[PDB]
Design a protein around this ligand. Structure first.
Ligand SMILES: C[C@@H](CO)Nc1ncc(Cl)cc1F
Length: 171
């Protein structure tokens, strides 16, 4: 059976407890924690690409008021569909399964200024999603996994001082 497991799930849960925030900038900002997954049940002999995108969680935006995240108004129109290709792509099943797959280099941005960055709307909540794409497949088989522990609100600046502190503590 294909199994894609979240690495460092208890680290993600420490952030999710506070409501996780990721900074978006013009030139793009790397995530902490980094999304890392373990993989079993691929064909070790087959070739696959790993893709990452971010799914909008809500039909509204958020705002931080009196130390609480609350519904913050109607959403901005959906960010353009940005997909990040894991740089090891394409590679053998054996490659993806021998050690956790790390998306350490993906950058989150609030400006369409290229560089393979992911555009997100500030004060909107997103859920990372990984796609495994089989190479040379006439059926173009794709598998998609979502990671609920990794949900975060995109921000231009940290709202929760506990997130500011946690980001310093664990990074
Ligand atoms: C939070 C802590 C709980 O034992 N777990 C982790 N902490 C930090 C790193 Cl670098 C990775 C982890 F997996």
């Amino acid at each position: 059976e294909l199994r894609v497991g979240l690495e460092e799930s208890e680290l993600w849960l420490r952030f999710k407890e506070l409501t996780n925030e990721m900074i978006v900038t013009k030139n793009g900002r790397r995530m902490f924690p980094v999304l890392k997954v373990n993989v079993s049940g691929l064909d070790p002999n087959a070739m696959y690409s790993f893709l990452l995108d971010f799914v909008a969680a809500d039909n509204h935006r958020w705002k931080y008021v009196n130390g609480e995240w609350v519904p913050g108004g109607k959403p901005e129109p959906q960010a353009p569909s940005c997909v990040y290709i894991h740089p090891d792509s394409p590679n053998f099943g054996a490659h993806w399964m021998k050690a956790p797959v790390s998306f350490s280099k993906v950058k989150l941005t609030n400006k369409l200024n290229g560089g393979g960055q992911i555009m997100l709307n500030s004060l909107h909540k997103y859920e990372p999603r990984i796609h495994i794409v089989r190479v040379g497949d006439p059926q173009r088989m794709i598998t998609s996994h979502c990671f609920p522990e990794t949900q975060f609100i995109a921000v231009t600046a940290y709202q929760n001082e506990e997130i500011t502190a946690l980001k310093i503590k664990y990074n």
